[PDB]
Design a protein around this nucleic acid. Structure first.
Ligand SMILES: [Mg+2]
Lengths: 43, 48, 120, 112
RNA sequence: UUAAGUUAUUAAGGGCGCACGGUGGAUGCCUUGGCACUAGAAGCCGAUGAAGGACGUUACUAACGACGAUAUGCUUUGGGGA
RNA sequence: CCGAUAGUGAACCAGUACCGUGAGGGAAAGGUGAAAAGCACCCCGGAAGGGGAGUGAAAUAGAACCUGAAACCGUGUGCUU
RNA sequence: CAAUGGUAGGAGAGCGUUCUAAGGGCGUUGAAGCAUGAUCGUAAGGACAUGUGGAGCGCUUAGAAGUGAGAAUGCCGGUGUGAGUAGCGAAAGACGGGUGAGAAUCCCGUCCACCGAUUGACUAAGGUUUCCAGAGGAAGGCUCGUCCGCUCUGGGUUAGUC
RNA sequence: CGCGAGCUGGGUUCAGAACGUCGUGAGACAGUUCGGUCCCUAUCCGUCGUGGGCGUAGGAAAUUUGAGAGGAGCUGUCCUU
RNA sequence: AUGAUGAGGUUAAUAGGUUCGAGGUGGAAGCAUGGUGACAUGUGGAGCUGACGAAUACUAAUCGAUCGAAGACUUAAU
């Protein structure tokens, strides 16, 4: 049966990903939180 | 369907008293002197 | 008669294959049960070859596979021809037997009794 | 008077190898070798290698005759099992133990 | 010799004690790192392009530091002494 | 005040293996020896392993390496059935 | 002379553990830990001996506590039992030769069999080197493996018009 | 009201829908009506079948007695008298 | 099921094969004749035939190994 997560590079980079996150204040919040944690991957 | 209690070591070792293999049914080969399976070809020599 | 872990059509095909292969090679290595069963098939083939007439040849063609043997000197002939032209001659005076089975030990991948079945 | 050989971390479960090891304990070296070569278990060639190694150790390091040699003791104890898994139905995973064995054989001429 | 009576021995395996091994990583000893504070600096950085990154850079070649195409570093002044 | 289940999540290439589409969630893993002196050579083995020899104060300190409990698994037996 | 069963519960006296203070000691002529023993006290518990271990630790008095576990469908690890049991994931193989320490399982050949509106040939997505050639067999392949989508080494993708 | 780790699942007792009836309503009625996932690889005793060990004072082959135990145990019609 | 049980292991009919049958099927193949042809008739109760009956060592049960007693005391009759 059709499961969830039918992957798609364009949609993955458009919904998540650096430029989408930087386009809202809350997205910039998540990048700030991830940098504060020392996370190696931000979006 | 499912065990009600452990199997103690005594019970286990009792159950596996007949879990063993027997020595092969082997005989000395008349031609070469090495052991072989009775009614089989001597693998060391190749006779009979 | 044995079933050899195989359906009726698959067992028939396998037995006639094994018979043809023993005829081609004069001696093969196989399992004990399959040799015990191919003994009868190949021996009835040699019986048909010993009669030599056309109806018997047409009857032995029912069982043998269309296999080709390269003799020496680039001589070429079928399994049927080998049956009726060289093996029937080898056993014209013998009134049965025609095969011998030599038990060998168990193979490695299973415990299967490997045997040599040859012609005699 | 005594010769030793150990095969460590043999990737066969000790419960499986001890079956074959039960057949050669206390037997003569020649009979032990024949038993090993003629019994069709996966552990027979592995035990045969350890036996031949012990016999060679006897001959080469202690200079004892390998005709008067008996299998003084033969045993296998557990080694460092490997832990694996199998995906069962409904997303559950069941453990698999790939156990290993330390196989020891000591041969002796039964004297002092 | 026969009758009547009595009692061994057996261990396929098991039980207890002991001896010797294995597995496993408790315990003890130890510290590379942490935790709570005291005294004294300091309390911003960015369009002169920041914070964080990406990719590179070595004689060979992965990863961490270090450093940018002048790349495993350059100049200068002062310590420094194989 | 803690001494590797403690003390930071992280004493060790740790916000990392890994999980999730994503915010997020989040480990486990310290110790040979004073010195690497880390076992030249011989033997069985394809190898792995091992037995000698040797280094070392010590090699059941041999790299999973300080100590090495218990559960658990074996092999012998004294007394029993 | 009298009293001394005991649950919720009250009261008292103590045993041990870590640390600190001061005094007094023990240790490579072997500390702590660990193991065994047929030892001592009314209990908690305290010694001694001998093995292992290889550098720290008692005693006295007094101070502090992360101070005592058998149970929480407790948490983390290790290991059992079930048990050599269930399973080993739709299906057709046989033999000959070859290679190797080892072959039902790898390579070649012949016959046989299965699909064939496809089990064939492209190509979107998606995945990222799995592609190729030599070498390898610890682990992964639900068995085996000489083989592999695994390991090692070295390679491989060429556009004015797609 | 023996027996669902022996079977079924029509009734009954979840979630859907409808009728009568009650409730302003959400909903309700042991009033009807159509529909509606029955899991489990047997450790122990027990039971049905089959083997090995030792004993039965030497070691064997066969033929046996029967202490005990189980099984069977029903009945119609016609003719004659 | 496997053990077990029973028939046998060469001084042998245990299984296979071979030969001879029983039962089953129902008229092989190749020829010949007839028909334009599908076919038909003849040779000829033909050919074939798992398991059932008999005979025959042609093939395989060819070599060999392991286990298995020496018979306890007491009393009375002897
Ligand atoms: Mg799934």
């Amino acid at each position: 049966v059709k499961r969830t997560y039918q992957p798609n590079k364009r949609k993955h980079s458009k919904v998540h990903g650096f430029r989408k996150r930087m386009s809202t204040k809350n997205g910039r919040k998540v990048l700030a939180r991830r940098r504060r944690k020392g996370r190696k991957v931000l979006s | 369907a499912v065990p009600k209690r452990r199997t103690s070591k005594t019970r286990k070792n009792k159950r596996r008293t007949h879990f063993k293999i027997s020595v092969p049914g082997m005989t000395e080969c008349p031609n070469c002197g090495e052991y072989k399976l009775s009614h089989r070809v001597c693998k060391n020599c190749g006779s009979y | 008669y044995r079933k050899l872990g195989r359906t009726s059509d698959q067992r028939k095909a396998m037995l006639r294959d094994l018979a043809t292969s023993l005829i081609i090679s004069e001696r093969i290595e196989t399992t004990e049960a399959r040799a015990k069963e191919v003994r009868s098939v190949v021996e009835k083939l040699i019986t048909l070859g010993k009669k030599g007439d056309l109806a018997s040849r047409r009857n032995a063609a029912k069982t043998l596979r269309n296999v080709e043997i390269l003799n020496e000197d680039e001589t070429t002939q079928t399994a049927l021809q080998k049956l009726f032209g060289e093996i029937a001659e080898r056993y014209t005076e013998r009134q049965g037997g025609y095969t011998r089975i030599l038990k060998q030990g168990p193979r490695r991948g299973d415990g299967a009794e490997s045997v040599i079945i040859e012609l005699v | 008077m005594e010769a030793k050989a150990v095969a460590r971390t043999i990737r066969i479960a000790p419960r499986k190898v001890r079956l074959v090891l039960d057949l050669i304990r206390g037997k003569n070296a020649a009979e032990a070798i024949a038993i090993l070569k003629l019994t069709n278990k996966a552990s027979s060639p592995v035990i045969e290698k350890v036996l031949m190694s012990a016999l060679a150790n006897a001959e080469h390091n202690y200079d004892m005759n390998t005709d008067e040699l008996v299998v003084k003791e033969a045993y296998a104890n557990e080694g460092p099992t490997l832990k694996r898994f199998r995906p069962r139905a409904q997303g559950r995973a069941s453990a698999i133990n790939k156990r290993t064995s330390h196989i020891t054989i000591v041969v002796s001429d039964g004297k002092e």
